[PDB]
Design a protein around this ligand. Sequence first.
Ligand SMILES: C[C@H](CCCC(C)(C)O)[C@H]1CC[C@H]2[C@@H]3CC=C4C[C@@H](O)CC[C@]4(C)[C@H]3CC[C@]12C
Lengths: 247, 13
Amino acid sequence: EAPYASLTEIEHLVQSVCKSYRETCQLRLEDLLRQRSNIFSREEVTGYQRKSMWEMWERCAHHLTEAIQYVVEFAKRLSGFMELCQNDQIVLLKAGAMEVVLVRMCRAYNADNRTVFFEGKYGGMELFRALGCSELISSIFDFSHSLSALHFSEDEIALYTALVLINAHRPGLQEKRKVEQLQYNLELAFHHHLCKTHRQSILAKLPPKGKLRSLCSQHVERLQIFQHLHPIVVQAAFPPLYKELFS
Amino acid sequence: EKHKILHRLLQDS
Ligand SMILES: C[C@H](CCCC(C)(C)O)[C@H]1CC[C@H]2[C@@H]3CC=C4C[C@@H](O)CC[C@]4(C)[C@H]3CC[C@]12C
């Protein structure tokens, strides 16, 4: 949204992106952290594992959809995004929404005991057994654990998720150059912030190219397998936005 | 493949 952004423009952009995240982060960090000792009991975990495949799938689809709505709001408030053509807005969100959710998950992940905040308490990956995709779940928790090692600040999460969304490499963009310019300026913002805080060492540690895409592609595959097994449940219960995004 | 909803969300005021 401007060729040759000045230092002042880039400082403003850091502020703007952090504000957009602040207004759309969904879960309050202090709430999440203060509830780390609240963990599902053995009985509660058993409860979850005894749940039907369809019920667990519909719960998880609901909660993901709620998370995705906050990412959409983030995108809408994100400097430059609404200026993009309508096609490219959709291409970026279809590709990036779930990626942003996977990144936002590190805030809700306790590396100490490998638990995630879900339905009011922290639970391990075993909580999700009824989904029937344990290896994918394990991969997702592994990914969260790799992020936990960076110990992002809230401002870092803001600037990094902006870049996860504004990725000029997504196939199907019609005005690639505009996205490349937005991406570059967001990179300048992220790099500026890291430079001032002496945190540019994180750059080398960020998730490898294609990793987020892999996790998302597996999610879609597992959804297709589920949908094949329980087609009426998806029709009757799953949020339409979720189907549009992933089916 | 279907993006009617996403389109509506984006233009939701
Ligand atoms: C790991 C599990 C299972 C995923 C199943 C799959 C891959 C088949 O969709 C998912 C289901 C629900 C997800 C949470 C929904 C919402 C949020 C809030 C957001 O602020 C941060 C991420 C989080 C906690 C999601 C984490 C991943 C969860 C537990």
